[PDB]
Structure formats: structure tokens, C-alpha cells
């Protein structure tokens, strides 16, 4: 299928960090720091909503600027259910669309049908049922919804633990009981059974929302994530290159405390 | 698959009437009247529950007596979730097991995993979501839950209309909206989409529970059922052979009022 | 249209009394007493429900017996929503079908589509909205739901007053306000506007349920009904011929107190 | 009828964009950009209500100025239920009256009787029942109520999906069930049945309220609208001519992502 | 009676506009513009209450100034239940007292006994029952309570429609039912029956509260009012003479759209 191609595409991000960037300068710092992809963002949606505005797809022009500035994959956000925003993003020729709850919802009841696109989608989830629903709709990659722009990892920890815990429950579960389990999750039975066989999520699972420090990033990796997303927080500080490198280093060496000491020492 | 074989098996019952019988005499009357199958029943579960007892699988001996007495397929009831009752019934070599809510529930949370058997199962449903869940569990044939032993068709009409109505809703529905629809039904998405393509249920759909008269049986057929189940009510009356024939005739000639007049004239 | 033909058919009953009969003897007494039609009834539905049973269409045989016994029109009851019962009744060749809430409901959500039949239907109503809904479905004649087999006129008076009162409200109403009025009635606007122009119901309106005495029958006529239905109560008394005649006489001479004295004097 | 003439009048706007304008300068920009009509507006009602004022019909003088400045049809708003505002607008000789919930309600219980006018009316709706009610009152054209002056498309998407979804439900629905369906919609049965036969709304259906970007406009068209309304937002920006052209282009080429990229590139 | 004399006095205002004036200059503009009476007002009660003060009878001196300045009748407000304020107003020799809910209530439970005065009273009402109660107390003229100093006609429309609608209901109503109707209105039966015979209110019925534009004034007249009250809004604008004349012209020519266009064109 093209689906498995998209899934495979997403797997090459495993082990990596993805950074929110608002311009080409930041994008290069990200790339040099060793980010595996960048997320293009006209403005931080936190700030647009804090001022009571609607947060939409970013201007294609500014996305084009970032796509040119770097050789690593570029991602951008479409509003949930806004399949035309996604068509535009596909046509600009970015690598991944993030169907993002951080932007203003466009459809209260329906997500984008992501199978109708040739490029892979990221979606958020709070639990396994939601993850499996996004995947069936054609998401090639899952992140935690976490908590947008607070710096608080508590929500991301809840989500990772929730998802991973249900997968562990599912792995050992009497097969006869999986029907009821699928009902309670309101998830497609066929994806539930596949998740059972795999013993993990059929797609790459990243942590997102709240990851603020190297320690946070490493925690996410130790809890069994495949990678992390980081916000614009990195670039709103001193030596952005250093803070960027630190989080990449944390994710690469997530089980080496000595390394984590080094990258955290003197960050502010 | 063996699944499609079981589904195909069940199609031979299309256009037919299935009658509850409590002995071999009744079974022969049923067969001669033109019933397409019989349902073997130690005792009427209505009466066992009315006297506050538990209603279980029938004695294999009495089932064996009925299997011998007739050449039409024989069905018997297993309690919901009682997979060992089903194993016994399979080994006796009956034709269809009815996983029946009319018997005392054995498992509050789980139905039998019907895929683990080589003979086909009937299950009940009140709506499409329930039907699709029973099918995914491996039911080869669906009936309405209706209302056991009241003679009141109202519940069966509700169920037929409910199921058929949702199928019609599903047939025309924007494909992008079917994901959410599957969530709301708590039904496997893949079976929902298949039902959409077929424009009907993937399995034979019978009416059951409350069908008392020729008019009732014909109504069910006109509402789009593939056949009907009838209770032991038939044999608690004056000329059981006549009443039996009448319901068969009603189902065969369900769109011929003239015929329905004839079979109803002078029944009591 | 055939609709207007059915409406016209029903208008021939204007000024008349319709009597429930359970056999041919009673039917002839009814006819000779001057009833404009008879309602065939295997058994009184009151008694079938009082014993917790289901009340359905009557046996066509006993209906045939009554159709033969008399030259006045014969009516019979179909369960609400039971369109096959109605097909049978049509094919027997009776004159009017009563879609009757006195029988056990067959469809909780839908009435018979009465346009699909060539013979006229009676329906019950409690108010104008309900009346207009039954008419749009193709009822040619409206009766009050009243109160089955209590002998208590209070419900019938409520219904007549309700319907007539809303018609009077409608007759004078600002045309610009009729849209909202139709919304509140949940009735088809086109039938509402027609009722406004006519200043009465587009169909014959009879009183039913609770009419026990000559005084009751005359009251209904004075309140603006076109005729009345009477139950089997008549025949559960002395000189049924006398009691029958009395109600007919009451309806014919409903504004002549002297007559009403005469027919009521010495009845019980 | 004059009704079908008004419906036909409105159909000429199919495929088009209608823009809110507050003066003649803006009106010409709209016309040159390729708008199919303009909506004349003294002031943005959002601002009048935000300052706690009453929003009424616009001054006829300023409407006259805009009618002269352009050759495309002119629309103006009357308060709901304010039939005299509508008479004035008709007499000024504008092309379409919008009975608009964006203005201060004049009649809590009744809309204008739009049949009493010779020029066509637009009304808003949230669902099919409301649409069919406005049409029966004589609206020649339906728009979504959406959400006035937020730039948030979510309400408009809900409304389109709602209306279109119920039409799809209605298209396939058992005819016998349409009576109850009309009751639940509180909509005229005759218009419900007509909508069933047509398989779409008897009138042009436009999207309105929240449409902010080319992507939004195209989404509405992809969801099956016949055209869109846009607010004064367009003219509160740089090169208003460019932003205006962009939305027109988006609606014309709503299924061409490449086009949508071009018109969205560099908009701000 | 003196009552019918007062009623007749009030009828000579039929067809007219009454304007709130706060000085003699405004009073003359009103008179020249063709107002049929003026309402003397020390200060706008809206402003006295907006500043948390009590709004009472106006200073007799300022009322005397207005009575001298014009030859048209002068009205003034007394607080509800404040019969001594009314005695003072009578003694000053004004023409009409308005027992006004716009002023601070003086008696929570009782209105002025208006029969004890030789000059006619105006009272407000929201519905027919309230109107009939005020009349029995001796009001010679009824206005809607509407909504003081908002410019919003919605409340006045509600009241007119309410009153007129109940009168229409009453006109056609079965006489036998009028007793209960009077109970539900908590209105004197004798005035209810009189209103029934007349087919309208026994006294002049004016619209008041919210009438802001010519269109508003004409709407009130088209809904069946006998005249309108207008607030000080007129004089808080440009060319007060023009705006004054416009509303008078609107009420005189309330069914001529062309006229309404002319008087509304260029008002602001």
C-alpha cells in the first residue's frame, strides 16, 4: 500500500528531535544542532490564541523559505478537519503534515481523511483508542497531545503512560476478551489485534507538548517514546545553538546520566 | 476463509421460517409444514425464568432425538459467553448454534469467540453496531433480539427499522464521515465500510421475537428481513400443523395479500 | 385525486353512529337500530389487555361473517404501523380501516402510510397537530382518542375542545404568524393553511371513546362533531336494541331536549 | 410561480463570491476582483453590538451610493421579522434582501413573510429543518449562520455538514418513515419530500460566517456549497484588491491545489 | 360616565405621534413637526436610574413651561401607585397622566385608582390581561411597556403581537369558554366580553419603548397600533426638526414604502 510507504517514511525519524522554527535562521540552527526535522510556524499558536485570534495554516511563502533553507524534512500544521489546508501544504511539497489541535479546530466532528494524501500525517493522542483512530484515518505517526506552550511535561507523561500501559495490557490479554476491549476503546478491532501482535504501536510514537529541558526529553525516551518534539522555547533563550544541541544530545544519550549532566550544566 | 463458508451456509435459509420445537413430534410437524430449520429446546426458557430458574443448554439427548427425526438443519441455544456449551453442541453435530439472550447470561462482558468453531452461529442485535460486533466475533447470521414470548412484534419492528435505517444512512454517507460514525457505533471500521459497499448486512438478517401471526411474519419480510424465527406459541394452539403452514406460506407469499387472507382466515 | 374520493366516502357517515360489534347478531341489531356503520371486533381489546395479552387484527373469518350479515359499511382495526394487517383488511374488502391505538402498538415511531391503500382510514387524535399529521399520512377521517372502555367522556371532551379551539384560533390568525404556529404543532404548513381557509378540519371529525349515554352522544354533536363511535357497552345491557336506538336517536335529534328525555327515560 | 422566478434569480449567483462593503470604493474593488454581488453595510454589525448598540437596516442613502457605483447585484440586511425594513429595501430597488441574524432581532417569534415581496430573500440556517422553514416562508437562497466576525470556520462547517448530511439521510430513507422525520425536523412535509426527490436543497446554498482565507472558501465549495459570503475582513488588510481576487480565484478553482497555493502565497 | 368621556378624549390622538420633550424648545419642534401631543420630562429616567437615583414626577415648573409653549395636549409621568403625584399633575392642569413603569415604582402591589381623577391616564401592558386590568382601574389609553431607552423594538413587537393575538383568539372563541379564559388572564370577565364584542381593545392602543426609526414607527402601525410614542432620541441628533417630521410622516404614510424611503434617506 502507499500507507506502509508513509509509515516507513516516518520510521526514519526514530531516535530524533523535531523543533518548531519560525524562520530560516532558526531552521539552520536546528539542522546544524542535529534535529531530524523542523516544524514550520508563522507564529506560535499559543500567542495567537492568547490574543483571542484564530490560528490557521501558516503562509505558504514562509514555509517555502524554510523548505529551501534546510535539507532535513519540513513539517507544517493544518487545522483539524481542514482538508484543504492539507491540500495546499501537500502542493507546496513539504514532507509531513501535522493535523494539530494546537491550531483552531475547523471541524468539531471529523478529522482529515489522511488516506487521500500522498504525504504522511502526524496526529496527537491522549490514549490508545485515540491513537488507533488517528492511524485508521491514515496518520503515519503519533505524538502525545501533551500541553501546548506551558513547559509542563505532566500531560505528556500521562499520555505516554496511558498509551504504553494499554499496549502492555493488550499484549497479554486473553484473545477472547479483545472484542470487548476494542468496543471500550472505540477503536477498530483489526488495528487493536495488530497492535497486540506487534506489542507496540504500528507507527512511530513521539512525545510532544511540555518538553522543556534535556531531562524532560530523556524521560520521554526512557518511557519508551521513539523521539520528541520541542517548541520555540529553545530559541527564546541564550545561545540557541547550545540549547538546541543539548536536547538532541539528551535524546541520543538518554540513558547516560553523565551526558545529561554535561548538557544541562549551565543552561539557565 | 472458513468464515465466508459459514456465511454461505447460512444463505440457504434465506426465505425460510425457523420454528422452536420441544420434541420430535413437533419437529416433524415443522418439517412437513415447510420450515427451513428447527430450533431444539428442552423447555421454553420463558417458563424456566418465569419460575425463577436458570435456562441453559438443552440436554444433548433430546437434541439428538430431534436431529434424527428430521432432515432439515437443527439449531440449539448456548448461553452467551458459554463457549463450553458451544463446544458440546458442535460435537453433537448440530448445524447452527444460537448464542441466545433468551437463555441465562453466562458472561456479562464477553460473547463466545465464534471463530473458534467450525459450525455457524446466530446472534441477536438491537441495532447495527451490535450486529457488526457480533459478526466480527464470528456470527454468520443475525436475528433481532425482539421480545421473547410476549407475542408483541413492536420490539422486532424497532430493531429491523433501526438496523436497516442505519445501513441506508451509511450507504449514502460522505466517506470522510464514516470514521466518526464507526466510533459512535463502537463497531469495527472495516465491517462498517464493507456494509456501506454491500448496501446491506454482510450476513443473513432474520426477524425474531414476537412474530405471532402470518401478518407479523409478512411485515418482517416486507421490512427487508431474509426470514423469520417463530416460538413454541404455534404448538400451544388447535391445529399446530395449520398454524405452522400458515406462517411458512406467509413468508413465501409475503407480498400477496390474497394469499395472506387465505392463510389467516379461520386461525383463531 | 383518490384522496378526495376517500374523504368523500367518509362524509357519507356524517350525522351517524358507529357501533362496536363482536358477532353478526349484534351487527344486525346495530343496523336495524339505524347505525351508519359497524366496527368488527373479535374480542373487546380492553379485555385482552386487561388480561395482559396482545390485541391484534381480528380473524378475517369473523370479519367476513359481519360483512355478510349487514348492508351498512364495515370497519375493522389494524394495529398502528402494521401495514400488513391493513393489506389483509383491504383484501377482505371491508369499507374502512381504523388505525387504532386501542390495539397493541406495532410500530412505536411510524403510522401506516395510508396513501398506499385504496380504502379509507380512520385515525385518532388528541389535538390539531396530531390530526393534521394523520391526515397528511392519508387518514380520511379523524376520531378522538378519548378513553377506551371506561365510559368516561372527559378525555373525548378535552380532545374535541382542543381540536376545535385551535381551528378557531387558526381561522382568525395573522397569516404571517401561521408559519411559527405550524412549527409548534409540528404539522404540515400546507394542511394548516388549508384548515385555516376551510375554517374546519379537511376531513370528517367523529367523537370516540367514553360515549356511554344519549346525553354524551348529543354533547359531542353539540360540541361540533360530525358523528360518534360507541363501544360494546350497548350490548352488555338490557334490551340492546333499545339502548342502540337511543344513541342513534340522540345523535339525530341532538338539539331536541324533549327527544333526549324520551330516549333516556328508563334506560338505567 | 413568482417563487420559482426568485429561485432562478438566486441561481445566477452559483459559483460566486459575495463581499461585504461599507462604501463605494470597496464596492468597486469587489466588482473588479470578480465578486458576483456585494452586500451593502453602513457599519459592521459586529462593532455596533460589541459597543452594545442596536444594529438595524442601513441608511438608504449609503445603499443608493453603492447600487450606483457597480453593475453587479446589491444585497442589504433587514432585521429578522422587520418586514417594513424589507419594504423600504425593496422600494430602494436593491436586488436581494438578507434577513440577517447579524442585525438585532426585531421579532423573537416570527420571520418576515418573504412571499409578500417581489425581490428574493436570503436567510441563514444551522440545519435542514431551519432551512426548509425559511424556504417555506419564501427565502430563495440559504446561507449558513456560521459565526459572525470571528474568522472561525468551525460553525459554518458544522452547518454545511449538518444540512448536507440530513439530505443524504433523506435521499435513501424509507418513504414510509419520512412523515416522522418531518415531524422531528418541524419542517413542512411537502418541502421535505421535494428535497428527497431533488437530492439537494430546492434553493442555492451558500456558506457564510467565518470564511477568512482562500483555503476556507475552497473547503466550503468542496463540501458542496454553491458559493460563499465574505466579510469586511478583506478590506482591513494590504492590497485589498489582491486579497479579494484571491478568494474569488479560490472559489472558481476550488479543486486545484496549485491555484490555491498561488493565491495564498504571501498574503500575511 | 366620565369614563367614556376620557376614552373619547384619548381617541382624538389616534393616528398620531407623541414625543418626549425635556424643554419648551423641543416641545415647539415637536408641535411644528406635527406631533399630536408631547410628554414632559425633567430628565430622561434612563439616566437617573443609570446613575442609581430615584426617578419621580417632574418639577411642576418645567411642566408649566411646556404647557404654555404649545397648544397640543401635554402628558407627564407619575410613579406607579403614587396617587398624590397624580393629584399634583391634575392640579397643574395637564391633559394626560402616564402612570409609568419608567419611573421608580412607588407601590409594589397597587396602581393608582385612576377613576378618582378627571383627566385621562395612560398605562403600559405586556399582554391583554394586564391591559384589561389597567383599563378597569380606569386607564383611558394603553401603551406597550416595550423597553425604555434601548432603541430596540423587539419588546414592543412582542407586546403588540401578544395583545393583538389574544384579542383575535378571543373574537372567535366559544362563549362558554370565555369564563376560563378570563380566569387565566386574571382579567375582569365583563371587560373580556366587551373586548370580544368590539373585536379590539376598548381603548386606544399605542406602541412605546424602542421605536427608534421611521421603519419602526411604521411597523408598529402595520401591526395594528393606533399611534406611537417616541423618546428624546429624536433631539439627541442632527436637524431634530427633520427627524421629528420623519417619524410623523412615517406614521401618517405607514403603508407607503416610497414615502418611508424618502423620510429615512439620509437620516444618519
Residue numbers in the entry:
A (entry chain A), B (entry chain D), C (entry chain C), D (entry chain B), E (entry chain A): 22 to 289
From the paper:
Using Arabidopsis thaliana Pdx1, an enzyme involved in vitamin B6 biosynthesis, and lysozyme, we demonstrate crystal scaling to suitable dimensions and numbers for time-resolved serial crystallography. Here, we report the use of droplet miniaturization for the controlled production of uniform crystals, providing an avenue for controlled substrate addition and synchronous reaction initiation. The approach was evaluated using two enzymatic systems, yielding 3 µm crystals of lysozyme and 2 µm crystals of Pdx1, an Arabidopsis enzyme involved in vitamin B6 biosynthesis. The method was demonstrated with lysozyme and Pdx1, with crystals grown in droplets producing equivalent (if not better) diffraction data quality to those produced under batch conditions.
Crystals for preparing seeds were produced by combining (1:1) ∼12 mg ml−1 Pdx1 with mother liquor (600 mM sodium citrate, 100 mM HEPES pH 7) as 10 µl vapour diffusion drops in 24-well XRL plates (Molecular Dimensions). Crystals for seed stocks grew overnight and varied in size from 10 to 50 µm in length. Vortexing with a Hampton Seed Bead was carried out for a total of 180 s by alternating between 30 s of vortexing and 30 s on ice followed by storage at −20°C. Batch crystallization involved a 1:1:1 mixture of 12 mg ml−1 Pdx1, seed (105–107 ml−1) and mother liquor. A popular strategy is to fragment crystals to make seeds to control crystal growth. Seeds effectively bypass nucleation, acting as nuclei to instantly initiate growth such that protein is shared throughout crystal growth. Lysozyme and Pdx1 crystals were concentrated by settling and applied to sheet-on-sheet (SOS) chips. Serial synchrotron crystallography (SSX) data for lysozyme and Pdx1 crystals grown in batch and within microfluidic droplets were collected on the new ID29 beamline at the European Synchrotron Radiation Facility (ESRF, France) using a 2 × 4 µm (V × H) beam of 11.56 keV X-rays, with a 90 µs pulse and 231.25 Hz repetition rate, and a 20 µm step movement between images. A JUNGFRAU 4M detector with a sample-to-detector distance of 175 mm (1.8 Å in the corner) was used to collect diffraction patterns.
